[PDB]
Amino acid sequence: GGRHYYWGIPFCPAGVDPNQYTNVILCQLEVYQKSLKMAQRQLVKKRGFGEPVLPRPPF
Amino acid sequence: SEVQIRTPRVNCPEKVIICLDLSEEMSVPKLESFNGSRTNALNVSQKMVEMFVRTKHKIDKSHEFALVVVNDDSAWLSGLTSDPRELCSCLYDLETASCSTFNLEGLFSLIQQKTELPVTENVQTIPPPYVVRTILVYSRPPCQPQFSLTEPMKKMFQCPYFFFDIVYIHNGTEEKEEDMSWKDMFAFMGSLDTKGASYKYEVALAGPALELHNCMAKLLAHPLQRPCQTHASYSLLE
Amino acid sequence: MSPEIALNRISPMLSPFISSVVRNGKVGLDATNCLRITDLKSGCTSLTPGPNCDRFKLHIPYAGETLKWDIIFNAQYPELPPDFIFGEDAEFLPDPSALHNLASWNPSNPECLLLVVKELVQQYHQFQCGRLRESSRLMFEYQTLLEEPQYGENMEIYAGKKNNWTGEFSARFLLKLPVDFSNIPTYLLKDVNEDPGEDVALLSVSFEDTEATQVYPKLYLSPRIEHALGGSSALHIPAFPGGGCLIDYVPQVCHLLTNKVQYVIQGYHKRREYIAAFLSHFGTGVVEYDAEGFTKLTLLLMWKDFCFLVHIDLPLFFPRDQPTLTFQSVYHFTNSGQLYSQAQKNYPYSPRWDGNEMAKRAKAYFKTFVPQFQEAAFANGKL
Amino acid sequence: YKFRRHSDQIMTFREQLLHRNLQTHLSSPELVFLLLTPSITTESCSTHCLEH
Amino acid sequence: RRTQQARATGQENILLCQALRTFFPESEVLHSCVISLKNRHISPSGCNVNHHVDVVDQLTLMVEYVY
């Protein structure tokens, strides 16, 4: 029986060079970063835009 | 594709409920210790749980912990606290007299009543605000049947943010007598994990105590970042 | 009224338009980002059951202020286009020739309403420019600023009516800066259902005079940018020195902000390469790792049937400073009740290495140091 | 004339353009526009107001 | 008329798979997300090779400075 990972398997499997799978798991992380932003922008409630940068107050 | 893991791999804060079986069987000093000889199951469990909590707290800090004991029914000692000291205060004060069997219904009811499960608009990409997991250290037989639970309990297990980890201390691999019943009761615990995935462990009363510590360490892994049990290996030094 | 509460009253045939508009969370550059839908009315015979609402009022954030525009649909004719009312802003002249998405109204496309409102806001910008034309002083800047399309087409402007006496005018510029914030990392919010939104940095300029004197600038940052630079309250911006030349001010802020952003993101991607290599190599026994920033990792390893933990802490200067390794025992506690552990920071390392080389060198360090740490834990620690 | 159920008493974007286009095609620069807004005055729907 | 019209009757992570397949196809079957429950070896994947995908973006920032 096979086990399926929606975000790919999080380790170097048997018969693969981990030195070359480093970039594969990097691609997993990059895809998660970019995907989460697109999934978040579909949500209704938007987070406040926080505070502005002020110029250096003198005196 | 047979079994599928949909949840993201993110370090969400954990609410960890640790359940201890208090049976006359737990007072057996038959566990071998790597320093001197002999040790008790309950004292090894106390060292193990203290180490687990002290370690988890040093990671991210945001983690929350809880302590529960099992007798005739579950019983809540201290829980949903980020400070581990409270837990240790309740931990080093336990008696193991067994006057009745152990009820899973009561444990599921207490866990449901003390904390609620979260939900999100998108479970495959949006990381949850927290993850709920329960560790059960048990030794006495479950008596096999006890019916097939209820709809609310199946819904508790059905949640992808809820995890149930188990360690079973048994004589199935020592005696090989009633080994059918021992393996069947372990499989009874192994027929609930099929709601996503979860970790399961088996230990003989011969120990040594090492195999129990070496066991608790494996449960440190974050359930969302933790690979499937069958894939996890630690001897990465050949 | 929260949008999730309003979306239960609207006629189902109209839900997608308002859904797209709400989920976009803005139209222009907004700055404040506090978009809302307020007034919602039946717009049909009172006896029409279930979800039925189709009239509403939309609060569109623009420049520094908020426009209150009434929008009208008819539930029993969902295919038909809406109608608009621009509150007390009577002088507003929307050119119907530029509203291509309104001329070609298509209910089959949920984003249609958004495109319509967007074009309307672009025309409102043009209207504000039409008002600016009367000042001449500020057009002196506006023209030169429009000659930079990456700024001109990502720009908004607003002007207040004359003071009854003295006849002074208040004004605002707003700019979206063209820097690559795409590679900024993620972070978890309290609600989770909250959205940090489009990663943007907005530069707002406000004036007391109709001339280039007494100027108040502010720089607003997306929540992700606040998290990346360690909070807005710990960062300053050069104020306008004097004279009139925003065309010379904006390039400075763009270059400096790009410098700071690249400073952080280089470190972030190098830490991600490190954590990715370490996962690729030893993930079969991974305990935990910082999926949000890649500043921490915790692995569980076994040496000759004895378990131990390694915590890797990565400093801000990860490519430069060595990452702190911390070996921890599962069996030993110190006198203070803490678990016996030892940190290593001075060890074989070169900042020029890649993830794979560092992971292999770390495996070598493990094989060479684990017995020493175990002997030390037995010597100092207590079971 | 136009009926806008629950609406502000001021002619819309579309209405001004349409009224002027009708003024053009019908050659009547003395046209009028009768705008009616019916509305309800309480949550109970016990009181209604037609403002024209 | 409406009654006659009514009676007339008028799941992989695709982004991850397409990004993985487009990134260095030299790895051939390396593009996968299924494993044997027993051994840590790859199983075949059905996500197919055919889709356009959008927003292919940076894997790591390729820059090096000092000071």
Curated annotation (Swiss-Prot), chain A:
Description of post-translational modifications: Sumoylated.
Cellular location(s): Nucleus
Entry remark concerning the domains of this protein: The tandem UIM domains form a continuous 60 Angstrom-long alpha-helix and mediate binding to 'Lys-63'-linked ubiquitins. UIM1 and UIM2 bind to the proximal and distal ubiquitin moieties and recognize an 'Ile-44'-centered hydrophobic patch. Since UIMs don't interact with the 'Lys-63' isopeptide bond the UIM-linker region between the 2 UIM domains determines the selectivity for 'Lys-63'-linkage, and its length is very important for specificity. The Abraxas-interacting region (AIR) mediates the interaction with ABRAXAS1.
Function summary: Ubiquitin-binding protein. Specifically recognizes and binds 'Lys-63'-linked ubiquitin. Plays a central role in the BRCA1-A complex by specifically binding 'Lys-63'-linked ubiquitinated histones H2A and H2AX at DNA lesions sites, leading to target the BRCA1-BARD1 heterodimer to sites of DNA damage at double-strand breaks (DSBs). The BRCA1-A complex also possesses deubiquitinase activity that specifically removes 'Lys-63'-linked ubiquitin on histones H2A and H2AX. Also weakly binds monoubiquitin but with much less affinity than 'Lys-63'-linked ubiquitin.
Family classification: Belongs to the RAP80 family.
Protein name: BRCA1-A complex subunit RAP80
Entire-sequence positions represented here: 275 to 330 of 727
From Swiss-Prot, chain B:
Keywords: Acetylation, Cell cycle, Cell division, Chromatin regulator, Cytoplasm, DNA damage, DNA repair, Mitosis, Nucleus, Phosphoprotein, Ubl conjugation pathway
Subcellular compartments: Cytoplasm; Nucleus
Predominant place of localization: cytoplasm
Coiled-coil ranges (or none): none
GO MF term list: identical protein binding
GO biological process: cell division; DNA repair-dependent chromatin remodeling; double-strand break repair; hematopoietic stem cell proliferation; mitotic G2 DNA damage checkpoint signaling; mitotic G2/M transition checkpoint; positive regulation of DNA repair; regulation of DNA repair
Any one of the GO CC terms: BRCA1-A complex
Main function: Component of the BRCA1-A complex, a complex that specifically recognizes 'Lys-63'-linked ubiquitinated histones H2A and H2AX at DNA lesions sites, leading to target the BRCA1-BARD1 heterodimer to sites of DNA damage at double-strand breaks (DSBs). The BRCA1-A complex also possesses deubiquitinase activity that specifically removes 'Lys-63'-linked ubiquitin on histones H2A and H2AX. In the BRCA1-A complex, it is required for the complex integrity and its localization at DSBs.
Similarity comment text for this entry: Belongs to the BABAM1 family.
The name this protein goes by in its record: BRISC and BRCA1-A complex member 1
Organism per entry: Mus musculus
Residue numbers of the full-length protein present here: 84 to 321 of 333
Curated annotation (Swiss-Prot), chain C:
Modified residues (Phosphoserine): S2
An individual GO BP term: positive regulation of DNA repair
Residues where N-acetylmethionine is found: M1
One Pfam family cited in the UniProt record for this chain: BRE
GO molecular function: polyubiquitin modification-dependent protein binding; tumor necrosis factor receptor binding
Subcellular location: Cytoplasm; Nucleus
Location of the region described as UEV-like 2 in the Swiss-Prot/TrEMBL record: 275-364
Source superkingdom: Eukaryota
Assigned GO CC terms: BRCA1-A complex; BRISC complex; cytoplasm; cytosol; nuclear ubiquitin ligase complex; nucleus
Keywords, alphabetical: Acetylation, Apoptosis, Cell cycle, Cell division, Chromatin regulator, Cytoplasm, DNA damage, DNA repair, Mitosis, Nucleus, Phosphoprotein, Repeat, Ubl conjugation pathway
Stretches assigned to coiled coil: none
UEV-like 1: region residues: 30-147
Record bears the keyword Acetylation: yes
Positions of transmembrane segments: none
Tissue: Expressed in brain, heart, kidney, liver, lung, testis, germinal center B-cells and various mouse cell lines.
Keyword Phosphoprotein: yes
Function: Component of the BRCA1-A complex, a complex that specifically recognizes 'Lys-63'-linked ubiquitinated histones H2A and H2AX at DNA lesions sites, leading to target the BRCA1-BARD1 heterodimer to sites of DNA damage at double-strand breaks (DSBs). The BRCA1-A complex also possesses deubiquitinase activity that specifically removes 'Lys-63'-linked ubiquitin on histones H2A and H2AX.
Database matches in PANTHER family: BRISC AND BRCA1-A COMPLEX MEMBER 2 (PTHR15189:SF7)
Domain remark from Swiss-Prot or TrEMBL: Contains 2 ubiquitin-conjugating enzyme family-like (UEV-like) regions. These regions lack the critical Cys residues required for ubiquitination but retain the ability to bind ubiquitin.
Family from the record: Belongs to the BABAM2 family.
Protein name: BRISC and BRCA1-A complex member 2
From Swiss-Prot, chain E:
Subcellular location: Nucleus
Assembly notes: Component of the ARISC complex, at least composed of UIMC1/RAP80, ABRAXAS1, BRCC3/BRCC36, BABAM2 and BABAM1/NBA1. Component of the BRCA1-A complex, at least composed of the BRCA1, BARD1, UIMC1/RAP80, ABRAXAS1, BRCC3/BRCC36, BABAM2 and BABAM1/NBA1. In the complex, interacts directly with UIMC1/RAP80, BRCC3/BRCC36 and BABAM2. Homodimer. The phosphorylated homodimer can interact directly with two BRCA1 chains, giving rise to a heterotetramer. Binds polyubiquitin.
Function of the protein: Involved in DNA damage response and double-strand break (DSB) repair. Component of the BRCA1-A complex, acting as a central scaffold protein that assembles the various components of the complex and mediates the recruitment of BRCA1. The BRCA1-A complex specifically recognizes 'Lys-63'-linked ubiquitinated histones H2A and H2AX at DNA lesion sites, leading to target the BRCA1-BARD1 heterodimer to sites of DNA damage at DSBs. This complex also possesses deubiquitinase activity that specifically removes 'Lys-63'-linked ubiquitin on histones H2A and H2AX.
Family: Belongs to the FAM175 family. Abraxas subfamily.
Name of protein: BRCA1-A complex subunit Abraxas 1
Species of provenance: Mus musculus
Residue numbers of the full-length protein present here: 254 to 330 of 407
